[PDB]
Symmetry: D2
Subunit: 463 residues, 4 copies
C-alpha cells in the first residue's frame, strides 16, 4: 500500500551554459593580473598586468629586451601558457583600466591572441601609446573604445557591458559578460566613492538591476577586504592635500609635490591648489607628460594657461634651473618619483644631479603610500634619507586608498547577489580575509565561494 509524499514543481531550462573562470595571474600575488572567462568555447580575457617587484629583485631590470617567456619565469607577468589547456578560443581582451597592474603585460602577451582589445577611451589611448613603444615587429590588436554604460556584441551568445566605477585612475569599469544563462561580473581594482573629484558616482542602480537579472559569478578583488569599514572618499585626500598645501605659516618656502602620474584626479587637485596659492604649476617627468597630457587631450581634465609640462631631461633640468633662479616660492613642481624610483625627477634632485638644490625648511609632499615591498621600501628610505639630510621636511601618506574595504565588499555582495564568488587580485592571505567576510554574507567555501590559485579553472554548469 502506498501514500503520496507531496509534489515538486520542476523548473524549465531553455539554455544550458558552461562557464569557465580561469585564474591566470594575480591570484597568488599582487601585480600580474589576468583572468579568463570562458563561455562554452569562446574566451574573454580580462586584464593583463605586470608585477614590478619581480623585476626589481634582478639587477638587470631591462624589462624591454626580455621577451614574454623570461618575464614569465620571473613572473613579473602572468603565465598564460596554460591557455593551451583551456578548451576555447579567445575572442576579446578587456582592460578594465590603464594602470600597469592591468595593462603592463599587454605588449608582451596580447599579440599572440587573434582578438581585439576592448577598453575605455582613456585606457584605449594609454594602450595605443604603449603598443607604439616597442617597435619590435609588429602585430597590433585593434582597440575598440567602449564607454561606461555601453554594451558590445561579441558573439550570438556573448555581450560585454561596461559599468562605471571609481579607482586611483580615471575611467575604470566593472565588466559584465552576458551569457544565455546570465551574467559574469568582474569587479577588480575598484572603490565605491560617493563624492568623487573627477569621475562619476558609481552605478548602484545598474548593480541592483544586474543582481535581479541574475549574476552567475562575481570575480572581485580581495586586496583590502581585510581593512575595516568603508574606503574613504577621494574627497578626503583632496581635503588633506589642500590643508597641507595652503595651511602653512611658512608659506614662501618652496614646495615639491610627488604622486602617481596615473592618478589624474589627484594631479588635477594639485594643479588647482597651485592656482589657489599663487604658484605656477609645472609638471615634470616623462610619465607625467604621458598620462596627464593624454588625459588633457581627451578632455578628462582642464589645465590652466600657465601650466608647464616637460618630458625630456634637459627641459626638466632647465626648468628646475629657471625655478631655482626665480624663487622656489613661485612654483609648485608636480613630479614623479614617490617610490624613490631610480631615474625619476625627485630621485635625481635628491642626488644633486639637478640645478634644483633642496635647502633646510623645503617641503616635500608625497601624495601616495609606500608599497609594502622591501625593494620600494628601500628606494623610499634612501630617497627620504637624502632629502632629509639636505634639510627637507617630509609630508608622507597624504593619500587615500583606491581599493574597496570590507563593508564596500559587503554592500557589493548584497547588490549583485552573485551565485558564485571568486576572490582575485591578491595573495591567498587576502583571499582568506575575503572568504571570512563572504561567509558572514551567507556564502560557503567550496560551494558558492571559491578559492582559486594561478592556473586553475572553475567550471560552472548553469541550467
Amino acid at each position: 500500500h502506498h501514500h503520496s509524499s507531496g509534489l515538486v514543481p520542476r523548473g524549465s531550462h531553455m539554455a544550458s551554459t558552461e562557464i569557465g573562470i580561469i585564474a591566470v595571474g594575480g591570484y597568488n600575488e599582487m601585480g600580474r593580473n589576468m583572468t579568463a572567462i570562458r563561455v562554452n568555447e569562446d574566451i574573454i580575457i580580462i586584464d593583463m598586468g605586470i608585477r614590478l617587484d619581480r623585476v626589481q629583485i634582478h639587477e638587470d631590470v631591462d624589462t624591454d629586451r626580455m621577451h614574454s617567456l623570461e618575464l614569465i619565469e620571473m613572473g613579473a607577468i602572468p603565465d598564460d601558457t596554460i591557455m593551451n589547456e583551456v578548451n576555447g578560443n579567445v575572442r576579446a581582451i578587456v582592460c578594465t583600466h590603464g594602470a600597469l597592474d592591468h595593462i603592463g603585460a599587454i605588449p608582451k602577451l596580447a599579440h599572440r591572441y587573434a582578438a581585439p582589445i576592448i577598453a575605455t577611451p582613456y585606457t584605449t589611448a594609454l594602450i595605443k601609446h604603449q603598443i607604439d613603444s616597442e617597435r619590435k615587429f609588429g602585430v597590433k590588436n585593434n582597440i575598440v573604445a567602449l564607454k561606461a554604460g555601453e554594451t558590445l556584441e561579441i558573439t550570438k551568445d556573448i555581450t560585454i557591458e561596461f559599468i562605471n566605477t571609481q579607482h586611483s585612475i580615471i575611467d575604470t569599469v566593472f565588466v559584465a559578460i552576458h551569457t544565455p544563462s546570465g551574467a559574469v561580473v568582474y569587479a577588480c581594482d575598484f572603490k565605491f566613492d560617493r563624492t568623487p573629484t573627477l569621475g562619476e558616482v558609481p552605478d548602484f542602480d545598474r548593480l541592483k538591476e544586474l543582481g535581479k537579472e541574475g549574476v552567475i559569478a562575481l570575480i572581485t578583488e580581495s586586496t583590502n577586504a581585510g581593512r575595516n569599514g568603508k574606503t574613504p572618499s577621494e574627497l578626503i585626500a583632496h581635503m588633506m592635500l589642500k590643508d597641507v598645501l595652503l595651511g602653512t605659516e611658512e608659506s614662501a618656502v618652496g614646495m615639491i609635490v610627488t604622486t602617481f602620474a596615473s592618478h589624474i584626479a589627484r594631479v588635477n587637485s594639485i594643479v588647482q591648489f597651485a592656482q589657489e596659492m599663487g604658484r605656477i604649476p609645472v609638471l615634470l617627468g616623462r610619465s607625467m607628460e604621458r598620462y596627464v597630457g593624454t588625459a588633457y587631450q581627451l578632455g578628462y581634465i582642464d589645465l590652466p594657461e600657465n601650466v608647464e609640462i616637460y618630458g625630456s631631461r634637459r627641459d626638466i633640468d632647465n626648468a628646475l634651473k629657471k625655478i631655482m633662479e626665480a624663487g622656489k616660492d613661485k612654483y609648485l613642481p608636480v613630479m614623479t618619483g614617490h617610490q624613490g624610483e631610480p631615474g625619476a625627477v625627485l630621485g635625481r634632485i635628491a642626488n644633486g644631479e639637478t640645478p634644483f638644490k633642496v635647502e633646510t625648511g623645503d617641503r616635500i609632499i608625497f601624495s601616495a603610500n609606500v608599497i609594502p615591498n622591501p625593494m620600494t621600501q628601500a628606494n623610499r628610505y634612501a630617497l627620504e634619507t637624502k632629502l632629509k639630510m639636505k634639510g627637507a621636511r617630509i609630508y608622507d601618506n597624504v593619500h587615500v586608498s583606491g581599493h574597496a574595504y570590507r563593508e564596500d565588499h559587503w554592500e557589493l555582495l548584497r547588490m549583485l547577489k552573485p551565485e558564485h564568488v571568486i576572490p582575485a587580485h591578491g595573495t591567498i592571505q587576502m583571499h582568506s580575509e575575503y572568504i571570512q567576510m563572504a561567509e558572514d554574507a551567507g556564502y560557503s567555501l567550496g560551494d558558492t565561494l571559491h578559492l582559486l590559485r594561478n592556473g586553475e579553472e572553475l567550471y560552472i554548469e548553469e541550467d
Copy 2:
C-alpha cells in the same frame, strides 16, 4: 721675550629672575599631567590629570574612595609631594582644558594649595560638576590675568579634541614661559576658532624663555588632519549607504563636543532622531549646551540614568531602529557603558545581523583597553553587527605642526611633555633639526625633576 694680551671686563652694570621648570607628572607616561613653573619664589601649577590605565590594572576602581597618597602609589595621579622640596609658593592652578588628563586629579590634590583654579568657562563648569575647595576663576581665550606684581597669565586659543582649549603664557619681567600641551593646529575647525598664529608670532618676537609642549604625536609624519576630515568621513559612513533602514549606533568621546555636534547634525540630515545615552554624555554635552557652546535640534533626547536609558532603548527597539541614531558611550569597551551593556544582551536593544556600529574613535594603545575593545567587538560581531572603526582624527599635533610652532615662538629653551620618553625622543630629533641641542637648549625631563634656567 714673548707676549700676548687680553681685555678685562668691568664689574659695572650697563632684579634677576630665576625660572624653574618642574616636571611633576605626564613626563614618563600618558595621563597624569602636571607641570609647575617657578618664577623666583612664586609658582604656577599647570594641569592636574589622572592616568586611567594604572587604575584599570586593579579590579576595584572606585577612584573617589582612595585618598591622594594611595592614588600616588598607583599613580594614577601626579606625585606632587615633590613640591615640598621646591623653593616657592603656589599662587595659581591653571587648567588648559577639561578632559581627565588635565583635571582628573583636581579633586584629589588641588585642595592642599592656597591658590585659585584658573580655567576657561567650559573647563570651570566641568571642574565644578566634578568636585561633588579652591576658588575657581573663569578666564577666556585672549584674556590676561594678573597673579602677582611680576607674574601675569595669558590664555591663547588653540584647538583640541575638547572645546575651549588654551595655550598658557606666563609673563615674567624676564620674558614668557609658554605651555602648549594637548593641542592641535586646525585651520578649519568645526567648532571654536582657528588658533592665534598672530599672537604666537608676536610672543616669539617679544621673547619666550621656555616652551613646554607635548610630544604625544611628534613621531607622526606631516601635519594633523583637521577635525573637518573626521566630519567628512563620518558623513560618508552615516549617509553613504545602500543599507539605509538598518539601524545604526554611533559611539565616541562624550567630551568631544565637536564630534557629537557633527553626529546629531547628520542624524537630522538622515531623518533619524538623535538619542544621546549615558551619564557622561549627559554631563559633557548637557554642560556644553547650557553654556551655549553647542546647539541641539528640538527633537534631541538625552538619558543619563540606567532605567531612563533602558526604557529609551526599549522604546527605540519597538518603534524601529531605522528611526533613531543612538549616540552612546563605550567606544573603548568600558565595562558598564551603554554599548558594552547592549553587547552583553543586558538591554532591551538587541543587535541583529546587518546593524552598523560606528566607532568614531581610535583604540587606545594600552593592553587593558585593547582587551575591553576586543571583547566588545567580538560580542557585537558574533551578534552579526558590521563594525566601522577608526572614523576619527587625532587631537594632537604632528611633527611639522611642532616644526612651525617652534619657528613661530622661537623659544630659548624647549621641554617636551605629555608622553613617554620614546615620544620625547621623537620630539627631540625634530627640535635638533630646528637648531636646538639636548642638555643645553633642549631638555629631556623625567617626573620629579626641576630644571633651572638663569639669566645670562
Copy 3:
C-alpha cells in the same frame, strides 16, 4: 581501417573504502580542536578541545555550570551537533594528549557518545582525574590506555596505532587509523625533537614505513607552518633556563619560576636546577599538584626528597610565609600563573594577597610565551606591571615552541608521502601558510590538498 594505440595495464581493486574527514572544531580557530574520521559507517573522533579566550571575553567565566550548548554558542567548545548529519556511528574517541586544547571539552561532549576514550597512560590519568570533577550524574566513558608503539583493534576493518612524538606535554602521539584501503594519519600538536629532555626520539622509521605502506590522508597542524626553519629542541629551553637560573652574580636574591603545569619536561628541568643551586624546590598551585603529581605517580618524572607540593590556598600561603621568614634565597618556588590568570599563585603574590612580598632585585622567570590574544596579553600586562612596580626583574620568554616549523612539516610530508593533506589546528591564515609549503612539496589545492572549514566533510573514495 584501424591501428592500435598501445595498451594499458589495469590495476586490481580488492577493497574499496569510503573515508570521511570531518572538521568539527579547531579548523577556523585555535583551541577547540575536534576531528572525526569516518571509515565507511564507523567513526573515530580525535580530540575534543576547548578555546579559552572565548570564555574570557565573557565576564561570567563560570565554565562549569554552563552545559554544552551554551559553550557551543560561545565556542569555546566544538560544535559537534553536525555529527547528526554525518553518515556513521562513533566507535571510539582518541585523545592524542592531555592538554586542554585536546581534552578540555571531553567532560562536556564525550558522554553523549557510546564509545570508549583511547589515550596514553598519562593522558588517560588526566582524563580520569578530570571526569571525576564535575559530579553531575553521571555517564563516564571507559578509558583504554594505549601506549606509543601499540595497536588496538576497533573493528574488522579499523585498527588504531599510536606513534610517539614530542610536544609541550609528555606522552603525545600521532594516531594512524588503518583501514582496508590504507592509513589515515593524524599529527596535530607535535614537534620533531631529536634531543628531548624526557620523552623518546620520534619514530622516523615507523613514519617512513607508513609512507611506504600507503597513507590515504594526513591531518596535520598548520599552527607554526609559517615559521621558518625547524623547531628548536626542548634542550635549547633547558640550556637557556639553566643559564638564567645559575648564571647570576646576584645569587642570593630570591627567584620565582612560573610555567605550564602541563609542561612536565620543563618543570623537571626546573627542579633539577633547584637541586643544582642549593635551593629547595617547592611547587605551588592546584594544577601543579595535579599534573606534576600525576606524572610522578605514573613514573614519568623523578622528584628529589626535599620537593614540596602544595595545592590548597592555606598550605600555599603558609608555605610562602615559611619561605619569607627563612630566606627567599633558600627556595625556588615553581608556581602557576604565567599568563596572569586571576587567582593563580603569582597573580595573588602580585596583588599582595600573600605573606610573600616581592622586593627590589627579586627575579621572576616566565618559562613560557605570551599567547597572542588580547585577554591574556592584558592579564600578563597587569601582572608584570604590578611585579615591576614592586621592583621585580622580569625574565620573559625563556621558552621554546611546542609546534613544528615549516621544514619539520616539509620532512613529515616527505616521510609519510600522503595521498591527501588537510591542515588543521589553526585559522584559515595559518592554513594558507601550510598550503603554500605543501604546494612547494608537489601538492595541489582542491586535488590532493584540502582546505576545510568547521562543519565540513571531505569525502575520499579509495580504490
Copy 4:
C-alpha cells in the same frame, strides 16, 4: 626678638681632575662608534667605526676613494672635527675589538693624531691588514698599559660576536672611567674566556667615576642567550635531518670566528669537507688561524679569489654537493658575495630543489639590507631552496645583563652609547630602576656633545 644659627665652613683643606666624556659617533645611530675620554688635558680616543647603511644608500660605494671629510658628510664615519674644540691632546687610540663598527674608520681618521693605536693581538692584526701611519701596540686582556704619569689603561676580557673583545678601564688619580661597548656576558663561551666578574667587582669597590656602555639591546628582556645556544641550534639544523645527502650551504659573519669554528667542527662530524669561500672569510678566519685563535682540520679549504672560488664550486658541483659544506659570505645578501652570486646563477654551483641554505645570522633591521636579503631569499626560494633563518644568537647584552653590570661596577655616572636615542631610552628606564637620575648621574648624550664631570 628672633633668632637662629648656622655653622660656617672653613676654607682649609683636610691636584684636581676634570673628566670630559665626548660623544663623537654612534650615539645617534648604529655603526660609526667613536668616544673620547678627556682627563684634564690628555685624551684617550676609544674606537673609530664605520656605518655601512649610510654608504649603501649611495650606489657608488668605493669607501677608499673618498677622503675623510666626504665620508663625514655622508657619515659613514664619526665627525671628529669637533675634536678641534676639545681642550686636550690625544695620547692614545684604543680599539676594543676588530669589527668594522670599531675599526672601520681607522684608515680615514687615525693618521691625523700623534698617538699610538692600542688593541688586542687579533684586533691589531686586522688593523694592519686593513691599512693597505700610527704605531700599533698589542695589549692583551688582563694587562695594563701606562699612557701618562696620571693615566693608565687596563684591558678586561669580555665576550662578543668577535674574538678578543675587551672592556677598557681608564685609571686616573680620581678613579676609573670604564668603557663597555659591543659586549655580552657569556658564562659558557665556545671560544675565549668567561668575562672577568671578579675584576669588575674590584673596580666597583675601587671607584668608577663613569661607565660608558652600549644600549643596543637594553630594550630586550632578560639575559643574552649564550653562544652555546647558537652552537646547539646550528648542530640541530645541520645534523638533525632525514634529508641527509641534499647539499647544504652555511652563511654567517666572516668575523664571527666562534661560529665558523662550530660550523667546521660540525662539517667534520657530518662527513663533509668544509670549504670556506669569499675574500673576507679568508681574511678573518685566515688571520685567526695564523695567530692560533682557531684550529682547522687538515682537510679545510679556503678560497678568497673569484676564480679560485668558482673553480671550487665547479669542483663541488661535479663531485657531489652532499660531500661538501660550503661556508660562505652573503648572509645579508651583499651584492658580490659568494651566496648572492650563486643565487644569480653566475656560478658553477646551481641551486636545485631541496638544497638547504642556513643563515647563521639575523637580518639587519635596515631597509637596504632587508631589500638585499629579500631579493636573495626570493631567488634562492625560486630555485627550490629550503631556507633555515635566524640560526643565531645576539652578540649584545640584554636588560638584566646591564642590571648586573651596573650593580657590579657601581659607577657614579652612566652614559649609554652604541645606539639610537630610542635604545638609550630603554637603557635609561633600566638605569632609573637602579637608582640613577637623568641629567644628574645618568646622561643622554648626542653626537658632538662633551659632558663635564668635576670632583665634589
